[PDB]
Amino acid sequence: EKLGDISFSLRYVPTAGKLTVVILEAKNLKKMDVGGLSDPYVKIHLMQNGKRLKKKKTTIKKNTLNPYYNESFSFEVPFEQIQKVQVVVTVLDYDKIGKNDAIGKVFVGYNSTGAELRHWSDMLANPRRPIAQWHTLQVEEEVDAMLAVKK
Numbered sequence: 001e002k003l004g005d006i007s008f009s010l011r012y013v014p015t016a017g018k019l020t021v022v023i024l025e026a027k028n029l030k031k032m033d034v035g036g037l038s039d040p041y042v043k044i045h046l047m048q049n050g051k052r053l054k055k056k057k058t059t060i061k062k063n064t065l066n067p068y069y070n071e072s073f074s075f076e077v078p079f080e081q082i083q084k085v086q087v088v089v090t091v092l093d094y095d096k097i098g099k100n101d102a103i104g105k106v107f108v109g110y111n112s113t114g115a116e117l118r119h120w121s122d123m124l125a126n127p128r129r130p131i132a133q134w135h136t137l138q139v140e141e142e143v144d145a146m147l148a149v150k151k
């Protein structure tokens with residue numbers, strides 16, 4: 001079962017230790033509501049060794065599997081710590097009643113792999129420039145597992 005794909009940009013300013021993630025849009029998201037579609041919003045957690053340093057979240061787009069956001073978020077990450085953090089991006093379904101269930105999840109950062117690592121590395125090699133990339137969303141539990149694997 002495909003969960004969907006998320007587009008975001010990454011920008012790192014080395015002198016200011018400023019990390020900017022713009023949630024651009026998502027597409028082909030999993031349908032999460034019986035009798036409807038999904039009500040997606042996107043969480044961003046800045047992590048460091050299990051602990052969460054800071055959280056952000058988009059607005060909610062109701063009744064769509066293909067939401068457009070273009071919402072920007074900045075994080076203070078000093079130069080010396082930028083290869084020690086994880087930027088965890090989660091698409092969830094909003095429900096007025098009950099816990100919001102995650103659709104899928106991905107993380108970028110040094111410990112990441114494949115296209116996630118490539119996005120992260122292209123950001124670091126191209127300072128002050130926003131790099132946009134698509135990511136396939138994965139099962140929350142699998143991502144949570146890999147976040148424990150240090151390089």
Ligand SMILES: [Pb+2]
Pocket residue numbers: 032033038039093094095096
């Ligand atoms: Pb819902």
